[PDB]
Amino acid sequence: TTIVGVKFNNGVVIAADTRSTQGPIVADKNCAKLHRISPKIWCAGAGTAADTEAVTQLIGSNIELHSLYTSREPRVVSALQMLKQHLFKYQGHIGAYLIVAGVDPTGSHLFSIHAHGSTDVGYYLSLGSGSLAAMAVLESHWKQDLTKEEAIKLASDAIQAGIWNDLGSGSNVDVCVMEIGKDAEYLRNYLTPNVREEKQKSYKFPRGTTAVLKESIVNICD
Amino acid sequence: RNNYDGDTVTFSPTGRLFQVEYALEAIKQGSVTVGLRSNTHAVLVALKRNADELSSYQKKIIKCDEHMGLSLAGLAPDARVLSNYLRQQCNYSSLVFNRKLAVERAGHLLCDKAQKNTQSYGGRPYGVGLLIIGYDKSGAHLLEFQPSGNVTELYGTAIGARSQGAKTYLERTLDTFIKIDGNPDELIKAGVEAISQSLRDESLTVDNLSIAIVGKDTPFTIYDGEAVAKYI
Amino acid sequence: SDPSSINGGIVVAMTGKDCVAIACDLRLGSQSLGVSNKFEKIFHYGHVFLGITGLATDVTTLNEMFRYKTNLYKLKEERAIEPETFTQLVSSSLYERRFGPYFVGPVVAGINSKSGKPFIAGFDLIGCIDEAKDFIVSGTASDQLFGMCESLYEPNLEPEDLFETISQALLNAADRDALSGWGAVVYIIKKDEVVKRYLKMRQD
Amino acid sequence: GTGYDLSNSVFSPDGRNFQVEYAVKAVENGTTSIGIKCNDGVVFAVEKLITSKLLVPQKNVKIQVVDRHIGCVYSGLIPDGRHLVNRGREEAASFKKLYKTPIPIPAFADRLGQYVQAHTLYNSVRPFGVSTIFGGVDKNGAHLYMLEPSGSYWGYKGAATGKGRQSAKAELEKLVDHHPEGLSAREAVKQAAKIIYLAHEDNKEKDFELEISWCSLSETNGLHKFVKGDLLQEAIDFAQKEIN
Amino acid sequence: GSRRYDSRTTIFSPEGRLYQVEYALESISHAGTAIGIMASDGIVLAAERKVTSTLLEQDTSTEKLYKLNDKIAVAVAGLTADAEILINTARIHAQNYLKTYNEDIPVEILVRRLSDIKQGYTQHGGLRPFGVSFIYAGYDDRYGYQLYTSNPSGNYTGWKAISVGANTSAAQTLLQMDYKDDMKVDDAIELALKTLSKTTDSSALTYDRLEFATIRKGANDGEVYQKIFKPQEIKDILVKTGIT
Amino acid sequence: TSIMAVTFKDGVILGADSRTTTGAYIANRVTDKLTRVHDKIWCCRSGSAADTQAIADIVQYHLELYTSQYGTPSTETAASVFKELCYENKDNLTAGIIVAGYDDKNKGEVYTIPLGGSVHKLPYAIAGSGSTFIYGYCDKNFRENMSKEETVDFIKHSLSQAIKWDGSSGGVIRMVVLTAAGVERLIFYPDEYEQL
Amino acid sequence: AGYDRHITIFSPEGRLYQVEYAFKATNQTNINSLAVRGKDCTVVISQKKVPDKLLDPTTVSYIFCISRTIGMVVNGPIPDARNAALRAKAEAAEFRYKYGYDMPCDVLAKRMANLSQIYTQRAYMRPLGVILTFVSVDEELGPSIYKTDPAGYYVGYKATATGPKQQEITTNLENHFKKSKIDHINEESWEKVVEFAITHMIDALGTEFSKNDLEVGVATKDKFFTLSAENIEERLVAIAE
Amino acid sequence: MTDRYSFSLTTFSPSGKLGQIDYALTAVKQGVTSLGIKATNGVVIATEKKSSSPLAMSETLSKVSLLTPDIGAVYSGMGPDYRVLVDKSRKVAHTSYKRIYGEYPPTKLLVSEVAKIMQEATQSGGVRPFGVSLLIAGHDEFNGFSLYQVDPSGSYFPWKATAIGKGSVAAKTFLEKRWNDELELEDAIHIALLTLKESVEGEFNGDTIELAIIGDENPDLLGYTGIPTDKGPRFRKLTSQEINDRLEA
């Protein structure tokens, strides 16, 4: 897994690859690793995937209720404080490693949070088994005052660093852009550089080829 | 009709706690007991009350430690509870700090313990009065405890039925018995005298007389029966 | 020692044109010892089919539990639960036991009665959702199953075909796993009807 | 209708809490006690009614210390006053434990105030039959306070409560006028002994024993201490001169 | 204290009656009447709605007939929301039994359990009883078709026909008159309608004032169908049975 | 990491490298280890980042509540809330904290709270893994009541040595100056402190 | 009649006497306060009365600094006033800790209102005899006045007043804004917004004030504060033109 | 805190009345009018914002609350009981539905949950019932549009249209006359506006009344684009302007 977040002049973009692994096996060649906390606060997750989903949906739900109660738009600094205090409680047993990005009425934000409950702030970040490939690219091509289109390119490339160079990362690139005065823009499969080639054969069986002992139609409706 | 006496959570408009005042009444119906002290000793004399003539006379004196004990006048199961709680507080002082609980501090504990029963729903005050004698690091002591929570240090006093007789006798005898240093039996004679000023009809028997003594080189000890004959 | 490997067994699910298929082996064993040849791992609640592999006592418990839950659902909601909703119920249920999980690998298959679209999903033992549109695999021969599926599967198979495909995927993969086999059942599922066939296979 | 004064947390139709007001009647039936705030500390004095010659002098101590730097005195139901001090003590320990600095007087006042108020919130308890005069010297100087059974408290130049309280207020009012610059610690004790003596007239049919204590920056290093021996007798003698 | 405000919901009158239970029963007599009639080939549940307006949405409405399970339904008289909470409880108990034994819960067991919760409120807790009476129609394999009722007291009984709510004695007399054991379901349908129109404190019986359900077999399955009637199906039987 | 706080004539200055590391991998090279728990009460954090962020967050909450009730807390009190959290939870924390702040009564103050939950008031305090290498240097170079410029240099030099030798330290030198004038944030980049 | 007059259950007319009676407790201080909004500030002003020569005048206050940004003024007896402040203080710190931002005025108000309402629904607890007025310059809303009572109600005010003589002040302000056509005191300086508020206080109440007779709280961008006797004096001079 | 009140405060009277439920309903009767109306492509809910001072900003107090993005509430009765009730209802839509099925509840079920909360307050130790009646309007996929009334007793019922509060009997009567099953959402807003004009004394504009609808999906209120399955909330509160515009009619 490789996830990154890059700040640009008017917002923030996060990106992730689409590969879920069980050991050395690829279970999903298109997993969505970009999660929604609120409409303009999004999350990339790495670690135990049940945990990254569990924790973003929980804090997601509490964030919604806080929002309805205070009649205010959700703040990133809140999803941060809530994530980190939940994680810290569980001493890292909740294996969620997270980059949280968003725009709110105070500006644009980018943080990373660790399973144990530590948080970091920066203009560019990465996590995952592709963390290193991605951060090499970011250390090479980042500058302040990125345009939107520049920050997409950058974040997009960094994921490609992990797709190619990291065994744990692969397949497609997912991006979400959240810009200060606009709707969060979510690009599922922004990049698909990994299409499987056409097989050398079709493996359709001639019907009747399987040996059957019993048939019986099944009762759906009571 | 009294609307202000159905529990202790309720103040009367005059600013009184009727349930507490009804408890006090139990004492004033209890059998008389008298306490007094010199600079060396402190004696408790108590008139035990029987039911029939076929009955035991009810024990009015309780030891709390080797250096401290009380007499009770009133609802006796409550005196069991309070003396018990005081036994523990003495014990605790000895185990944890290797220190004999100062008599003055026993008073504080009883007071604070009684008070709690006068401020909470469903509770009820203690129906008993106590005379505490002890000899600690500041010498001889005598304390009187009322279920109101009030505890007062005195040279002498009496509580219960007809107690005022002994009480006034003590006020006149004060400058006399305050000097009975080094002679317990003379301090008890004064104590058993005083208790006769509350004797309406019956006289002191060797069965209704109970007496406790504590002081400088004398641990709290209770005399009843034969042992008390020589003073009556 | 590995709870997901004491009893053995596998489940594979697949989506074709206006249909879905879900298959399982029939084996239940204790390590090397074959105990039962009739232990099915595919259950349904209305028109939602759930296949469970893993520790057998949990497969059983989980089925009883999802019956219970989908019963109270129908009662309160007055409709049968849909695949996507169920898949969410499975996930939240497994996560309830996050630090003491059920040792299973569940697989959901069905057709949305309103939208008509075919649906399959898979989970690990603590509820993370595999949201694939092609096939989902589970159990002790999950590796063999992956290899066979990636090759054999092509999208939009008619029911008669998809049956041939999913059976051949199940069969050969189970023959490369000591802990799976002893018979098989395949469910071909459409909106109108659901057919259930028992395959013939080597009994060793 | 009627019966608003039977349960503790009930608002009467004019918005009052009669049980609190009844508790105040128990305070008024108390002996009188005062606090005089001087230029570097506070004096506390109290009337101890001598019911008989059987009492021991001066062995029925009423003034209480909280922590090391706070004096408390109260009029009314005494066991209630001890219960309140007990709570003040726990509260002051808990404060020191966490914050290291001994509790500042206003902080401490609020601690009792919130706790007294609390007993005017439910019908499961009765209010405290005491008004408490307390204070000492914190990092910000000297503070004097008085606290009523309602939970009400304010800072005072001087305070009195109980039986002889109105004579006392007139006395304290006088001192406040003549000395707008400040009373000294040693003068404040002498003056405090007078006011108790004066206020004893509401009770003249019984004899009384006097108690004084002070927390003074220059006379006690900001620690709460009792006036004993010479300094006490010196103030008794000042009192018995000013009544003639 | 707070003792004065306690109505003591759980004590005997000097007749040895439970005040609140009787008062709750009196409440239930003001509720729309429900009928259960058990025939050889099924059970009928009919009830009249308290709530009526041309603007009341009836396709989506329910206050009388609830499904407990596929074998058991219940007809309600009293506090709808009180019945709602007891109903939920009972659904869970049926599922718990299923989870445990891998059989559908036998009708009496589910009835006893629900009745026993009801009785609990009449002996501890200081809470008001539930203002509900239920008729239960059900089928198990031990006793076949069954009818039962329970009321706030905790008592339940078994019936070939019964009614709860308004005008029960009227209804109990009219049923007892024309019920026979050889009754078929189509017969029992009519009788329950007849009884309702002779008890209703309303002008007549329209389809929109009616709830109606039947628990029978489908002649082909030897299986148990629970049919709750739609408004148009109820109108059909009102025209049919000759009440137009 | 390398952290220190030094008292001087006008107040107190806190310093730190900006490197947090996970093994040999530098997880963050621009870390801010200087942490505000009050207007003029700051801390230097070292140890578990999670343990140490969480502790600071709780202390910030406590002094904020303190403030609204009893006005401004003493530096000593800030140190006490820290000690209390660190001592009573000693089994489940890896935190080493230097607390530093300013009063007009008290001027600059420095408390160090090491792994014990012990607390120590010092004229200056070093801590973190890089600290070992500059024990000798600082003992030879600390003078009391230095000027602001002297002190900023004393920290610059010490921390550049700690960063030089300890690979757990590095990146930028951050400082925070606490005087009556208020609060001044300083930064120093590699190219500057390397060639000293 | 009935016990329905002693605890917070419905009377047959569907009212809650204990709530109504608590509203009466608010006035027994005979202290009036108004609140007003400027351009980028918010001012509360309340009467100060020290009836006893023995009182320390510096200790007598019904304005509380809840947070850095929130001030609260209380019409009611201080025991209940302090109880409420203590809560708000505690409730606003906790908010910040949990959510990483300063508690909004309106939100703290909604919170205190909800606690208030539970006292009207639960029998074991009495409502508090106070009306709370919250002020701040909210970072998202601008200058704010939010009031809560023992019913558990809460509203947003453009300006407001509270106390026995509430109605005088209220109509006085209603009239000023009826001419103004703007919902705030169009003035950039908070000290000319204090002066305005002391002026309308003077008219409606028909009385004069010395520096010891008022209490003033100001809420600016990221600070709420109370004026001393002397800062007040400085306004009291400047008004007399 | 010694809650000794562990007994019901609603008990049956000899007649069979629940005293405190009736008195609660009596408080509802005295509250400002609100109403709801169901069309074929929507539901509208209306109420009068009765300002308790022109010094009060009435936009600071909505009387119409979003519960889920497909469900709104309005009430008549005591405000602080409604406020609290809305909070609890938003939370159970999560804790008891969202956090389990990944969906928001259907209108009936959330309503039922609300009912249950209200039923508990007419039976549990030491509480009075709620003194509100809510009209809850909503949409869901399998049930379509609906409109529910829920009373202090905890009893609830579905309506084609209805009103609650002061002129509930007048307004109800007026609604039967204008209601058919072929109403468009635009027709029902019109009717709701009229019905409200009757029970409104003073000024009647877009600032003194409050309207919300459950209509079509508003993806412009979603806040993000990307997922083509999420189309946005069907609940929409109306502006002063949109109300005033429809007033030229």
Ligand SMILES: COc1cc(/C=C/CCCN2CCCN(CCC/C=C/c3cc(OC)c(OC)c(OC)c3)CC2)cc(OC)c1OC
């Ligand atoms: C005992 O004290 C010490 C500890 C350490 C630290 C040791 C290890 C560091 C901590 N971690 C170890 C490495 C693992 N880790 C995980 C980070 C992100 C995981 C990426 C990822 C990979 C996957 O595939 C494997 C995923 O798919 C399952 C996935 O989910 C989307 C995410 C973070 C934490 C270092 C020391 O000095 C040398 C030391 O002093 C003696």
Ligand SMILES: COc1cc(/C=C/CCCN2CCCN(CCC/C=C/c3cc(OC)c(OC)c(OC)c3)CC2)cc(OC)c1OC
């Ligand atoms: C700057 O941030 C960091 C902090 C830390 C964590 C610092 C904590 C150090 C942990 N310990 C070192 C300090 C010393 N220590 C115990 C001392 C060992 C001596 C054994 C002993 C045992 C006893 O028990 C009986 C004794 O009592 C008699 C005794 O006498 C002194 C000695 C154990 C624990 C580690 C880092 O990476 C390298 C790091 O860099 C990013």
